[model samples]
Target chain A: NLPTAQEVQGLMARYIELVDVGDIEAIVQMYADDATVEDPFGQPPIHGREQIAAFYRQGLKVRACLTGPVRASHNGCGAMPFRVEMVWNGQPCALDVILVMRFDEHGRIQTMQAYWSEVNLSV
Target chain B: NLPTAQEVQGLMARYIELVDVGDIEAIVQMYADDATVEDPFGQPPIHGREQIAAFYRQGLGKVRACLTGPVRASHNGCGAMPFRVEMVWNGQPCALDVILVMRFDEHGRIQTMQAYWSEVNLSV
Candidate 1:
């Protein structure tokens, strides 16, 4: 099912906000029961809500700011380029990340893949 | 550096056409000498223009079509592109929804092209 730009943008915003507030349950609930998330482009995907929750639980607190030209089109697919500012290993770090999301009929993310390399992380 | 929308979109368009026409050298020319490509996310990155070219060359034959979709950019000169590719994998026809995060050089050539997608997402 195709999702409206509104749904994708709203979900992305809420997801980012949840990260800031460390709202793990709420964030996990945003995904479908069988969704998969791959945090770093080259890393393996975490399948299902349980693994997804466990993965993000230890992840850093992030301030996700959308860069520009965010678009969502047919099949509930959307693409966004953004920056994530956070602390990593007790040091200030800012990383450029890109996300392409595929949503299910219920507007929950079915696949969320993030792209970035460790080189983007600075201390 | 992050590229503008036009810059990234142009590159992606050229890339798609090049893939369709099977112009390996031309497509390879769009990258910086030190660019890296990691398609399907979990694989190791193929680095350098030569390595990147070889990877694409090997895979291009299996590609039936490269369809460009929506793209978004950051003012700093980087862009994220969403696309779908129809190809034959393991002798089975399939389509995959792909996302590529591209960082560009000042000259607008690709400095890094990191792709996000997986076989699990492929529709056979």
Candidate 2:
């Protein structure tokens, strides 16, 4: 079945707002109990709700604003791709970020893998 | 209308294959007459077919190997691709993993590419 935007769509939308607000704890709650997160393909993976929350806590300290079109794919789990526009090292920075997630029965994210980079952060 | 996968996907698939095979000329042909590439957003952009070709020719020559994983994209002319690129740099073999953000034109050619890769992902 073609994945239509329904229940899963709302959570995906909330992700950016939460990230923008730096609400690390609330963002963690959106994931399932055993969710896993891999930011960038080669880095060590973060597992479960607690660790994931802790991970974002420090990283979220940086303020970010979304400045590009956001896209999401529905069904068979789903994928959400967007960009982060922020100030890094006191200069404007941008990242091409893609969040891949699957949902639990409770509608929480079961898996979250984010692909992005710190490269190319310049004026 | 936004681009369909059918309108642009094949050329990207061919792009990786050409890169893997060190087919620099074929790879450059994937661009439009006036394509632009600003690999790793901080760098200056390369414009037009011949200049684009010359740029990749230098890059592809250094690439001893290339592997592309699954691509995630949308109908809106965008895709984020994860990949591993290998080469000999500084008298040593290096593996540089990176992601390429591709925006396609209507003719199934790459309009622009914003590559998000840096030294942080490199291993020698």
Candidate 3:
């Protein structure tokens, strides 16, 4: 079975919810233990649940608000990818983010690598 | 056979060429007939080859330089997606960027629908 747009959107929405509520643990649960996050410009990839948690923490400190909607399409179930358009802080600044999420055979998030515009870092 | 990361990346690279050369026809050829492009905030959707071409034309007029790397991952084979970029004017004065691409059944064209930040419209 292929992953539907709705399912991927649900995952994205859940991520927004967790971030809005500042539930670090909940956010981490969305990713597999060995998940990886790459933030543009060939930066060192953040791997594993623990590092991902820390990354979120650091992001929250600088960013006052994180809210947006994601657009997604899937090739099949557990192999969907999506992009997120989010606003940071109270300013009009925003981020154009792309993430490719892979799910394990059990349907858990296995790996996700994100790419976004690093030049628009105005929070 | 599923679309691998390399294949998807190749598609993206070709897309960049089509845009840079202002080849409206080539760009449109990448999309499926029922392909749809959606910007953020519940805006109108652009469907089909003709309209998608027009959208690219309008974009090319405003954007001075658009270049970036796309990060991608596939579920298995059939479904693969990626994002392109936007940077109006030049460096020092940057703009918000986000764009996506989706492929379709025959794998000959794309079924792309993109969403991005609209508030950073300095060019247009």
Candidate 4:
């Protein structure tokens, strides 16, 4: 079951929409039941759907506003997988982020990891 | 055929060796014939073998020395890839780097690329 380009693009769009609207539930729904999300350091990796949802809930509380257009590219051909980039805003700060999303056989997101550079904020 | 962990590791090692020793020819050989290398902004993207080799030659002249340790993890099973982190030294400064390498078809070549950051300099 190969993931189509449209499916990958839909996931990218949904990710941004959930983040921009601060809808933690909708965001969590996009992930598979056992998806995992990890940040660089200081924070522990969020495992399982409930924990992952809680992570976003806490994040939304601290972040007053957010907005970004998603950009992504697929690698390989069949199980291609994708990396998406987003530019996000909080109250007094903003940053650029890259996320690598891997899908399961059914096109459900199995794992999604985000990489960001704080220095990118200055640019 | 699926790429073994050993194969991916070899590509990473070769990349570090070529960059550190300033072997532009070997470095260029790792990439696929149609590979594309893009710098953030200032420089135009380097396409094809010859241009890619020249990019490394010019870079080596400007770079005094380089060293690094590799770290990586595979994901999604079959098509797993790898990344490396390098601590590089120039004449006056040192910088930390992270590179993501992707492989194309056939076992012999890399078809690889990389991305790096300069700000990690202050830490190490």
Q: Which candidate is the best by TM-score?
A: 1
RMSD of each: 11.6, 17.2, 12.1, 13.2
Clashing pairs in 4: none
TM-score of 4: 0.44
Clashes of each: 6, 0, 8, 0
lDDT for every model? 0.70, 0.64, 0.52, 0.49
Judge the docking of candidate 1 as incorrect, acceptable, medium or high.
incorrect
What DockQ do the predictions score, one after another? 0.06, 0.04, 0.06, 0.05
Q: What is the lDDT of residue A18 in candidate 2?
A: 92
Worst 10 residues of 3 chain A by lDDT: A75-84
Model 2 TM: 0.52
Cα error of candidate 4 at position B81, Å: 16
My TM-score estimates for the predictions, one after another, are: 0.53, 0.52, 0.46, 0.44
| Runs of candidate 3 exceeding 4 Å displacement | A1-97, A100-123, B76-94, B120-124
lDDT of 2 by residue, A74-108 (tens): 34244444566666677776665566566766777
Full ranking by lDDT = 1, 2, 3, 4
* Per-prediction TM-score, chain B alone: 0.86, 0.87, 0.66, 0.64
Q: What is the per-residue lDDT of model 3 for residues A1-123, given as tens digits with 9 covering 90 to 100?
A: 134545655665566566656788888887778877755423577889999889977765222222223444443122223333345554545443455555554444666655433432334
lDDT of 1: 0.70
Clashes of 2: 0
Error of 1 at A78 (Å): 12
TM-score of 1: 0.53
